[PDB]
Design a binder for this molecule. Structure first.
Ligand SMILES: NC(=O)[C@H]1CCCN(C(=O)Cc2cccc3ccoc23)C1
Ligand SMILES: [Zn+2]
Length: 139
């Protein structure tokens, strides 16, 4: 659970996208686990345009927001799931922090805005799919 609503766009983990996200598809990328679908209402989330490596993310499995240091967007091996075969996911940032599979979609934020959303995790780590490079979300 969890999405980013900026202007006329809904941003979700592609593996959790609904039929409505696919029937109103703008852009999707399985290598990033992202899908952006069109919306009728005007979303008000601000996207960060920055190179921050510290922030706060929401963890639904603990009902808690946690401060985290995270890595720079990169290609990281992600083990095979029911949604994807074993592959490298690009634009992924790791942090030391608790996460569980239902945590996908939890927003990562810094002082500048929305950085990305929980997409992977395990073993005391949490991986976030970055969205700061997607400049078309604001235009
Ligand atoms: N991006 C992917 O390919 C995902 C697809 C769903 C499964 N993936 C996970 O990482 C499961 C998982 C385990 C343990 C903690 C967490 C936190 C978020 O997912 C967690 C990989
Ligand atoms: Zn920032």
């Amino acid at each position: 659970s969890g999405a980013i609503y900026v202007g006329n766009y809904r941003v979700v983990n592609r593996h959790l996208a609904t039929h409505n996200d696919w029937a109103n598809l703008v852009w999707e990328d399985s290598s990033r686990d992202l899908l952006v679908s069109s919306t009728t209402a005007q979303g008000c989330d601000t996207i960060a345009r920055c190179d921050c490596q510290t922030g706060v993310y929401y963890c639904s499995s603990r009902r808690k927001h946690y401060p985290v240091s995270f890595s720079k967007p990169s290609l990281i091996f992600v083990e095979a799931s029911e949604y994807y075969p074993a592959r490298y996911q690009s634009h992924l940032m790791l942090a030391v922090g608790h996460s569980e599979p239902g945590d996908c979609g939890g927003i990562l934020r810094c002082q500048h805005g929305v950085v990305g959303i929980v997409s992977t995790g395990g073993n005391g780590l949490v991986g976030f799919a970055d969205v700061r490079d997607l400049l078309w979300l604001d235009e």
